């Protein structure tokens, strides 16, 4: 009939089409510093074990 599916008056609200770049976070240097610290702690634990044994 005279009533058909027509877009609502004023149009539809805007949508997002483009991609979102989310590459934020931890990087290489922090991992290196953390690994270095963990390795030092491991070396200390190793020495303590090797002496007690």
């Amino acid at each position: 009939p005279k009533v058909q599916d027509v877009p609502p008056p004023g149009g539809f609200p805007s949508i997002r089409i483009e991609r979102k770049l989310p590459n934020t976070g931890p990087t290489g240097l922090a991992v290196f510093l953390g690994f270095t610290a963990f390795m030092a702690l491991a070396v200390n634990q190793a020495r303590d074990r090797k002496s007690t044994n």
Binding site: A46, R49, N53
Partner: protein, 293 residues
């Protein structure tokens, strides 16, 4: 004999069945599906249906293959899995983990024999590819074990590889070697990243696909059993005393990594094992050796 063997074998069978159920339960959860619900209500009984049904299916007479080797391949795998678990839980063998390494080098035979049964020109290459992967990542596992033995000493100070003594202390120094042990364990179980088979095996290139009865059943059960053994070894060596929860968690981790990572091509994984994993494991070995006693 001893009553302990019953107390080891029965838990392995139950656990392997629920390992198979877990594999799909996790994959469904990752893909917004649900655990199988038509087999029963709780879902506890889902694997038993598959095994019992596989028993019912009519046997197929062997074709153009030696009967002995065909029967032998399941027996070999079902023997290696049993010996491994029973030497992991019920023995005091000073070099017990070295024995486990030997038992893992014998898993190559089952794949090879299965390939031989096909006797196809394509299948000869396909089996050679699988065995190449297993031997290549077994070398790396051996180097990692060498790293494990430098840090493992007993109360009397005697160097050894007793699973109870390596388990007794947790050493954070070894964690760099545990990552390599975990990647190699993925490779030895032919998980997705190192799952060369699936792409080649869509067509009948050759594999355990030939069996379709009690023979096929044991292979799949053994596959999960080996994966669980690797999880136990990762726990016993790098994560302290044996914990059932940890073994299950490591298996779940295997499934998670499987899901999240695409497979590799033949050349790529083998190039990773020779020119990436092996130099890293050698550097970790030399570093641990140079740290000293």
């Amino acid at each position: 004999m001893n009553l302990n063997i019953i107390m080891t074998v029965l838990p392995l069978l139950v656990s392997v069945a629920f390992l198979t159920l877990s594999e799909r339960a996790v994959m469904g959860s990752l893909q917004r599906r649900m655990g199988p619900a038509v087999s029963g209500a709780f879902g506890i009984l889902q694997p038993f249906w598959d095994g019992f049904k596989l028993a019912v299916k009519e046997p197929i007479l062997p074709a153009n293959a030696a009967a002995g080797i065909f029967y032998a391949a399941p027996l070999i795998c079902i023997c290696i899995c049993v010996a491994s678990w029973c030497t992991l839980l019920l023995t005091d063998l000073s070099i017990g983990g070295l024995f486990l390494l030997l038992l893992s080098s014998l898993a190559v035979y089952g794949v090879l024999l299965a390939g031989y049964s096909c006797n196809s020109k394509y299948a000869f290459l396909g089996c050679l590819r699988s065995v190449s992967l297993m031997i290549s990542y077994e070398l790396v596992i051996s180097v990692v074990i060498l790293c494990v033995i430098l840090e493992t000493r007993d109360g009397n100070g005697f160097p050894c590889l007793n699973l109870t003594e390596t388990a007794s202390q947790t050493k954070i120094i070894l964690i760099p070697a545990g990552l390599l042990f975990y990647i190699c364990s993925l490779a030895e179980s032919k998980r997705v990243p190192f799952d060369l088979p699936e792409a080649e095996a869509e067509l009948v290139a050759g594999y355990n696909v030939e069996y379709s009865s009690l023979g096929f059943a044991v292979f799949f059960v053994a596959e999960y059993g080996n994966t669980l053994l690797m999880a136990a070894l990762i726990n016993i060596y790098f994560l302290g005393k044996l914990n059932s929860a940890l073994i299950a968690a490591i298996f779940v981790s295997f499934i998670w990594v499987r899901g999240t990572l695409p497979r590799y091509r033949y050349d790529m994984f083998m190039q990773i094992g020779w020119k990436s994993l092996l130099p890293v494991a050698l550097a970790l070995y030399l570093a641990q050796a140079s740290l000293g006693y």
